[PDB]
Amino acid sequence: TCPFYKKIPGTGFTVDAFQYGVVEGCTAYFLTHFHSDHYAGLSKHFTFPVYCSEITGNLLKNKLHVQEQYIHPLPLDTECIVNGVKVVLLDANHCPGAVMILFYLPNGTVILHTGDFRADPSMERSLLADQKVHMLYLDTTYCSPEYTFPSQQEVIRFAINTAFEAVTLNPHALVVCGTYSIGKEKVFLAIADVLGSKVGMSQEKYKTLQCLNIPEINSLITTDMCSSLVHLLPMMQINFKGLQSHLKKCGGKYNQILAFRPTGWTHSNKFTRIADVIPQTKGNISIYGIPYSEHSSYLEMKRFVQWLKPQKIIPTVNVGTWKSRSTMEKYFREWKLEAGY
Numbered sequence: 001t002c003p004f005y006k007k008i009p010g011t012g013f014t015v016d017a018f019q020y021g022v023v024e025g026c027t028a029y030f031l032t033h034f035h036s037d038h039y040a041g042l043s044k045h046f047t048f049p050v051y052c053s054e055i056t057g058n059l060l061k062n063k064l065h066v067q068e069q070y071i072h073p074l075p076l077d078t079e080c081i082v083n084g085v086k087v088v089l090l091d092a093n094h095c096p097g098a099v100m101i102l103f104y105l106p107n108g109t110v111i112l113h114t115g116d117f118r119a120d121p122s123m124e125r126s127l128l129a130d131q132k133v134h135m136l137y138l139d140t141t142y143c144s145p146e147y148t149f150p151s152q153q154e155v156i157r158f159a160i161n162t163a164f165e166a167v168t169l170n171p172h173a174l175v176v177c178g179t180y181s182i183g184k185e186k187v188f189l190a191i192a193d194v195l196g197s198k199v200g201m202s203q204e205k206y207k208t209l210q211c212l213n214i215p216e217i218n219s220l221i222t223t224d225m226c227s228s229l230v231h232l233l234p235m236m237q238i239n240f241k242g243l244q245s246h247l248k249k250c251g252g253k254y255n256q257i258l259a260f261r262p263t264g265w266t267h268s269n270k271f272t273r274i275a276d277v278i279p280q281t282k283g284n285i286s287i288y289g290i291p292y293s294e295h296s297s298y299l300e301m302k303r304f305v306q307w308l309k310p311q312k313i314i315p316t317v318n319v320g321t322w323k324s325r326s327t328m329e330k331y332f333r334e335w336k337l338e339a340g341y
Protein backbone atom coordinates (compact mmCIF):
# COMPACT_ATOMS: atom_id res chain seq x y z
CA THR A 1 0.00 0.00 0.00
CA CYS A 2 1.58 3.27 -1.23
CA PRO A 3 1.49 5.98 1.48
CA PHE A 4 -0.09 9.45 0.95
CA TYR A 5 3.24 11.33 1.25
CA LYS A 6 4.52 9.55 -1.93
CA LYS A 7 1.52 10.63 -4.05
CA ILE A 8 1.14 13.97 -5.91
CA PRO A 9 -2.56 14.99 -5.77
CA GLY A 10 -4.35 16.05 -8.96
CA THR A 11 -1.84 14.14 -11.11
CA GLY A 12 -1.02 10.56 -12.12
CA PHE A 13 2.40 10.86 -10.43
CA THR A 14 4.22 9.15 -7.55
CA VAL A 15 7.70 9.92 -6.13
CA ASP A 16 10.12 7.19 -4.91
CA ALA A 17 7.32 4.57 -4.94
CA PHE A 18 8.68 1.37 -6.52
CA GLN A 19 8.09 -1.19 -3.68
CA TYR A 20 4.24 -1.23 -3.69
CA GLY A 21 3.58 -3.13 -6.96
CA VAL A 22 1.42 -1.43 -9.60
CA VAL A 23 0.15 1.78 -7.96
CA GLU A 24 -3.51 2.42 -8.93
CA GLY A 25 -3.73 5.43 -11.29
CA CYS A 26 0.03 6.04 -11.58
CA THR A 27 0.99 6.96 -15.18
CA ALA A 28 4.56 8.11 -14.37
CA TYR A 29 6.94 7.15 -11.55
CA PHE A 30 9.54 9.79 -10.56
CA LEU A 31 12.84 8.76 -8.93
CA THR A 32 14.64 11.56 -7.06
CA HIS A 33 18.02 9.76 -6.66
CA PHE A 34 19.84 6.40 -6.70
CA HIS A 35 19.75 5.41 -2.97
CA SER A 36 18.35 1.97 -2.16
CA ASP A 37 15.51 3.01 0.24
CA HIS A 38 14.18 5.21 -2.64
CA TYR A 39 14.64 2.82 -5.64
CA ALA A 40 13.56 -0.32 -3.67
CA GLY A 41 11.60 -2.54 -6.09
CA LEU A 42 13.04 -1.40 -9.49
CA SER A 43 14.50 -4.11 -11.81
CA LYS A 44 14.88 -5.26 -15.47
CA HIS A 45 11.20 -6.34 -15.41
CA PHE A 46 9.79 -2.86 -14.61
CA THR A 47 7.48 -1.79 -17.50
CA PHE A 48 6.20 1.75 -16.62
CA PRO A 49 7.77 5.16 -17.47
CA VAL A 50 10.46 6.31 -14.99
CA TYR A 51 11.37 10.03 -14.89
CA CYS A 52 14.73 11.05 -13.40
CA SER A 53 18.04 12.87 -14.00
CA GLU A 54 20.56 11.73 -16.66
CA ILE A 55 22.92 10.34 -13.95
CA THR A 56 20.13 8.41 -12.21
CA GLY A 57 19.15 7.03 -15.63
CA ASN A 58 22.74 5.80 -16.28
CA LEU A 59 22.63 3.91 -12.95
CA LEU A 60 19.18 2.42 -13.67
CA LYS A 61 20.40 1.14 -17.09
CA ASN A 62 23.77 -0.28 -15.98
CA LYS A 63 23.39 -1.32 -12.31
CA LEU A 64 19.67 -2.37 -12.15
CA HIS A 65 19.30 -3.28 -15.89
CA VAL A 66 16.08 -1.37 -16.42
CA GLN A 67 15.24 -1.40 -20.16
CA GLU A 68 16.12 1.76 -22.09
CA GLN A 69 12.55 2.22 -23.45
CA TYR A 70 11.24 2.95 -19.90
CA ILE A 71 13.99 5.43 -18.81
CA HIS A 72 13.05 9.13 -19.32
CA PRO A 73 16.00 11.37 -18.36
CA LEU A 74 15.21 15.12 -18.03
CA PRO A 75 17.69 18.03 -18.07
CA LEU A 76 17.95 20.27 -14.99
CA ASP A 77 16.61 23.85 -14.74
CA THR A 78 14.31 23.34 -17.77
CA GLU A 79 10.50 23.47 -18.04
CA CYS A 80 9.29 20.04 -19.34
CA ILE A 81 5.75 18.74 -20.00
CA VAL A 82 5.11 15.20 -18.68
CA ASN A 83 1.67 13.61 -19.30
CA GLY A 84 0.13 17.08 -19.64
CA VAL A 85 1.76 18.65 -16.54
CA LYS A 86 4.68 21.18 -16.38
CA VAL A 87 7.61 19.97 -14.22
CA VAL A 88 11.17 21.20 -13.45
CA LEU A 89 14.11 19.23 -11.96
CA LEU A 90 16.51 21.17 -9.65
CA ASP A 91 19.86 20.07 -8.18
CA ALA A 92 19.27 18.77 -4.59
CA ASN A 93 22.89 19.16 -3.34
CA HIS A 94 22.67 15.50 -2.12
CA CYS A 95 24.49 12.68 -4.03
CA PRO A 96 25.33 12.65 -7.79
CA GLY A 97 22.16 12.83 -9.93
CA ALA A 98 19.88 13.78 -7.00
CA VAL A 99 17.03 16.19 -7.77
CA MET A 100 14.16 18.16 -6.28
CA ILE A 101 10.97 18.26 -8.41
CA LEU A 102 8.67 21.31 -8.97
CA PHE A 103 5.14 20.35 -10.12
CA TYR A 104 2.81 23.00 -11.66
CA LEU A 105 -0.65 21.46 -11.12
CA PRO A 106 -3.43 22.06 -13.65
CA ASN A 107 -5.52 23.83 -10.93
CA GLY A 108 -2.76 26.50 -10.28
CA THR A 109 -1.23 24.89 -7.19
CA VAL A 110 2.60 24.58 -7.11
CA ILE A 111 4.30 21.70 -5.24
CA LEU A 112 8.02 21.29 -4.40
CA HIS A 113 9.28 17.79 -3.55
CA THR A 114 12.82 18.08 -2.16
CA GLY A 115 13.71 14.36 -2.38
CA ASP A 116 16.76 14.08 -0.13
CA PHE A 117 18.61 17.46 -0.02
CA ARG A 118 21.17 19.61 1.78
CA ALA A 119 19.60 23.10 1.80
CA ASP A 120 21.91 25.92 0.65
CA PRO A 121 21.47 29.73 0.21
CA SER A 122 22.25 29.23 -3.54
CA MET A 123 18.78 27.61 -3.88
CA GLU A 124 17.26 31.05 -3.10
CA ARG A 125 18.47 32.13 -6.64
CA SER A 126 17.27 29.09 -8.56
CA LEU A 127 13.97 28.90 -10.51
CA LEU A 128 12.32 28.71 -7.01
CA ALA A 129 12.61 32.52 -6.82
CA ASP A 130 10.06 32.95 -9.68
CA GLN A 131 6.77 31.92 -8.02
CA LYS A 132 4.84 30.96 -4.90
CA VAL A 133 5.04 27.34 -3.62
CA HIS A 134 1.89 26.09 -1.87
CA MET A 135 2.95 22.63 -0.67
CA LEU A 136 6.43 21.37 0.35
CA TYR A 137 7.30 17.64 0.65
CA LEU A 138 10.36 18.05 2.90
CA ASP A 139 13.46 15.91 3.74
CA THR A 140 13.21 16.17 7.55
CA THR A 141 16.13 13.74 8.35
CA TYR A 142 17.77 16.18 10.85
CA CYS A 143 14.75 18.29 11.93
CA SER A 144 15.83 18.89 15.57
CA PRO A 145 18.22 21.58 16.95
CA GLU A 146 20.78 19.08 18.32
CA TYR A 147 21.67 18.14 14.76
CA THR A 148 24.69 20.33 14.14
CA PHE A 149 27.66 19.59 11.86
CA PRO A 150 30.31 21.61 9.90
CA SER A 151 30.34 22.69 6.25
CA GLN A 152 31.45 20.07 3.71
CA GLN A 153 34.42 22.37 2.88
CA GLU A 154 35.63 22.38 6.56
CA VAL A 155 35.34 18.56 6.77
CA ILE A 156 37.31 18.06 3.51
CA ARG A 157 40.04 20.48 4.75
CA PHE A 158 40.42 18.29 7.88
CA ALA A 159 40.59 15.06 5.83
CA ILE A 160 43.17 16.40 3.27
CA ASN A 161 45.42 17.86 6.03
CA THR A 162 45.22 14.68 8.18
CA ALA A 163 46.03 12.34 5.25
CA PHE A 164 48.85 14.48 3.85
CA GLU A 165 50.53 14.80 7.29
CA ALA A 166 50.35 11.04 7.95
CA VAL A 167 51.72 9.90 4.58
CA THR A 168 54.51 12.58 4.52
CA LEU A 169 55.63 11.35 7.98
CA ASN A 170 55.34 7.68 6.81
CA PRO A 171 55.50 7.08 3.02
CA HIS A 172 54.58 3.40 3.70
CA ALA A 173 51.15 4.29 5.16
CA LEU A 174 47.96 3.28 3.25
CA VAL A 175 44.80 5.42 3.30
CA VAL A 176 41.42 3.60 3.28
CA CYS A 177 37.95 5.19 2.81
CA GLY A 178 34.60 3.43 3.52
CA THR A 179 31.57 3.54 1.15
CA TYR A 180 28.14 1.75 0.88
CA SER A 181 26.29 3.86 -1.71
CA ILE A 182 26.86 6.75 -4.09
CA GLY A 183 27.50 10.15 -2.48
CA LYS A 184 30.42 11.67 -0.55
CA GLU A 185 32.85 11.06 -3.45
CA LYS A 186 34.72 14.31 -2.56
CA VAL A 187 36.17 12.62 0.54
CA PHE A 188 38.24 10.01 -1.33
CA LEU A 189 38.84 12.13 -4.46
CA ALA A 190 40.26 15.10 -2.49
CA ILE A 191 42.57 12.86 -0.44
CA ALA A 192 43.88 11.01 -3.53
CA ASP A 193 44.49 14.36 -5.31
CA VAL A 194 46.70 15.74 -2.47
CA LEU A 195 48.68 12.47 -2.35
CA GLY A 196 49.22 12.26 -6.16
CA SER A 197 47.46 8.89 -6.37
CA LYS A 198 44.49 7.33 -8.14
CA VAL A 199 41.76 5.74 -5.97
CA GLY A 200 41.77 1.90 -6.11
CA MET A 201 38.50 -0.04 -5.79
CA SER A 202 36.52 -3.17 -6.80
CA GLN A 203 35.22 -3.69 -10.33
CA GLU A 204 31.66 -3.22 -8.99
CA LYS A 205 32.41 0.18 -7.36
CA TYR A 206 34.41 1.26 -10.46
CA LYS A 207 31.33 0.51 -12.62
CA THR A 208 29.12 2.64 -10.33
CA LEU A 209 31.50 5.65 -10.49
CA GLN A 210 31.74 5.35 -14.31
CA CYS A 211 27.99 6.39 -14.44
CA LEU A 212 28.30 9.72 -12.54
CA ASN A 213 29.54 12.22 -15.25
CA ILE A 214 32.43 13.38 -13.04
CA PRO A 215 34.83 15.41 -15.27
CA GLU A 216 38.16 13.70 -16.07
CA ILE A 217 37.14 10.58 -14.04
CA ASN A 218 39.52 8.23 -15.95
CA SER A 219 42.46 10.25 -14.51
CA LEU A 220 41.22 9.75 -10.90
CA ILE A 221 40.08 6.07 -10.34
CA THR A 222 41.37 2.53 -11.05
CA THR A 223 40.77 -1.19 -10.49
CA ASP A 224 44.56 -1.74 -10.09
CA MET A 225 44.88 -1.81 -6.27
CA CYS A 226 48.70 -2.20 -6.37
CA SER A 227 49.18 1.10 -8.26
CA SER A 228 47.13 3.11 -5.69
CA LEU A 229 47.77 4.31 -2.08
CA VAL A 230 44.13 5.34 -1.46
CA HIS A 231 41.78 2.31 -1.38
CA LEU A 232 37.97 2.15 -1.15
CA LEU A 233 36.35 -0.64 0.86
CA PRO A 234 32.79 -1.48 1.92
CA MET A 235 31.76 0.54 5.03
CA MET A 236 31.31 -2.77 6.91
CA GLN A 237 35.04 -3.54 6.62
CA ILE A 238 36.09 -0.23 8.31
CA ASN A 239 36.99 -1.76 11.69
CA PHE A 240 40.19 -3.14 13.27
CA LYS A 241 39.61 -6.78 12.15
CA GLY A 242 38.61 -5.84 8.58
CA LEU A 243 41.51 -3.42 8.13
CA GLN A 244 44.08 -5.88 9.61
CA SER A 245 42.82 -8.39 7.05
CA HIS A 246 43.16 -5.92 4.17
CA LEU A 247 46.73 -4.96 5.22
CA LYS A 248 47.75 -8.65 5.05
CA LYS A 249 46.57 -8.76 1.38
CA CYS A 250 48.87 -5.86 0.31
CA GLY A 251 52.04 -8.04 0.34
CA GLY A 252 54.26 -6.05 2.72
CA LYS A 253 53.90 -2.85 0.68
CA TYR A 254 52.48 -0.99 3.71
CA ASN A 255 53.04 -0.95 7.52
CA GLN A 256 50.27 1.47 8.69
CA ILE A 257 46.59 2.22 7.82
CA LEU A 258 44.83 5.56 8.19
CA ALA A 259 41.05 5.03 7.59
CA PHE A 260 38.02 7.34 7.21
CA ARG A 261 34.34 6.54 7.99
CA PRO A 262 32.18 9.41 6.63
CA THR A 263 29.05 9.13 8.73
CA GLY A 264 26.30 11.70 8.99
CA TRP A 265 25.61 13.05 12.46
CA THR A 266 26.83 11.23 15.57
CA HIS A 267 26.40 12.64 19.17
CA SER A 268 30.20 13.15 19.12
CA ASN A 269 29.01 16.39 17.35
CA LYS A 270 27.35 17.84 20.49
CA PHE A 271 30.63 18.22 22.43
CA THR A 272 33.50 18.23 19.92
CA ARG A 273 34.72 20.65 17.23
CA ILE A 274 35.94 19.28 13.84
CA ALA A 275 39.45 20.65 14.61
CA ASP A 276 39.56 18.61 17.88
CA VAL A 277 38.52 15.22 16.33
CA ILE A 278 40.73 12.25 17.27
CA PRO A 279 40.82 8.69 15.91
CA GLN A 280 40.28 5.29 17.48
CA THR A 281 43.65 3.50 17.32
CA LYS A 282 44.88 -0.09 17.76
CA GLY A 283 48.56 -0.76 16.95
CA ASN A 284 49.37 0.47 13.41
CA ILE A 285 45.66 1.18 12.50
CA SER A 286 43.77 4.47 13.13
CA ILE A 287 40.08 5.14 12.23
CA TYR A 288 38.56 8.66 11.94
CA GLY A 289 34.79 9.22 11.99
CA ILE A 290 34.19 12.45 10.03
CA PRO A 291 30.79 14.25 9.98
CA TYR A 292 30.38 14.67 6.21
CA SER A 293 26.60 15.21 5.66
CA GLU A 294 24.57 15.23 2.43
CA HIS A 295 21.41 16.27 4.37
CA SER A 296 20.41 19.73 5.75
CA SER A 297 21.44 20.64 9.28
CA TYR A 298 18.56 21.94 11.46
CA LEU A 299 19.67 25.56 10.83
CA GLU A 300 20.06 25.08 7.02
CA MET A 301 16.56 23.49 6.85
CA LYS A 302 14.99 26.27 8.95
CA ARG A 303 16.55 29.03 6.73
CA PHE A 304 15.31 27.39 3.52
CA VAL A 305 11.73 26.90 4.80
CA GLN A 306 11.50 30.46 6.25
CA TRP A 307 12.65 31.83 2.84
CA LEU A 308 10.25 29.63 0.80
CA LYS A 309 7.20 30.39 3.06
CA PRO A 310 5.12 27.31 2.03
CA GLN A 311 1.41 27.14 3.00
CA LYS A 312 1.66 23.44 4.03
CA ILE A 313 4.59 21.10 4.84
CA ILE A 314 4.50 17.29 4.42
CA PRO A 315 7.53 15.54 6.02
CA THR A 316 9.00 12.55 4.13
CA VAL A 317 11.46 11.31 6.86
CA ASN A 318 10.88 10.31 10.51
CA VAL A 319 7.16 9.81 9.72
CA GLY A 320 6.71 6.52 11.66
CA THR A 321 6.31 7.68 15.32
CA TRP A 322 3.83 10.04 16.99
CA LYS A 323 6.70 11.63 18.96
CA SER A 324 8.66 12.44 15.77
CA ARG A 325 5.57 13.78 13.99
CA SER A 326 4.60 16.03 16.96
CA THR A 327 8.18 17.36 17.38
CA MET A 328 8.42 18.33 13.66
CA GLU A 329 4.98 20.01 13.67
CA LYS A 330 6.05 22.16 16.67
CA TYR A 331 9.19 23.35 14.83
CA PHE A 332 7.21 24.19 11.67
CA ARG A 333 4.84 26.37 13.75
CA GLU A 334 7.74 28.10 15.56
CA TRP A 335 9.32 28.91 12.18
CA LYS A 336 6.04 30.31 10.78
CA LEU A 337 5.36 32.50 13.88
CA GLU A 338 8.94 33.86 13.91
CA ALA A 339 8.97 34.81 10.20
CA GLY A 340 5.29 35.95 9.95
CA TYR A 341 3.92 33.80 7.06
Ligand SMILES: c1cnc(Oc2ccc(-c3cc[nH]n3)cc2)nc1
Binds near residue numbers: 212215
Ligand atom coordinates in the same frame (compact mmCIF):
# COMPACT_ATOMS: atom_id res chain seq x y z
C1 LIG B 1 39.57 15.61 -7.99
C2 LIG B 1 38.50 15.20 -8.75
N1 LIG B 1 37.23 15.26 -8.33
C3 LIG B 1 37.08 15.74 -7.10
O1 LIG B 1 35.86 15.85 -6.51
C4 LIG B 1 34.62 15.73 -7.18
C5 LIG B 1 34.47 16.06 -8.51
C6 LIG B 1 33.23 15.95 -9.11
C7 LIG B 1 32.12 15.52 -8.39
C8 LIG B 1 30.79 15.44 -9.02
C9 LIG B 1 29.64 14.78 -8.56
C10 LIG B 1 28.67 15.04 -9.49
N2 LIG B 1 29.23 15.82 -10.43
N3 LIG B 1 30.53 16.09 -10.16
C11 LIG B 1 32.29 15.22 -7.05
C12 LIG B 1 33.53 15.33 -6.44
N4 LIG B 1 38.02 16.16 -6.26
C13 LIG B 1 39.28 16.07 -6.73
Ligand code: NI
Binds near residue numbers: 033035094116
Ligand atom coordinates in the same frame (compact mmCIF):
# COMPACT_ATOMS: atom_id res chain seq x y z
NI1 NI C 1 19.49 9.69 -0.05
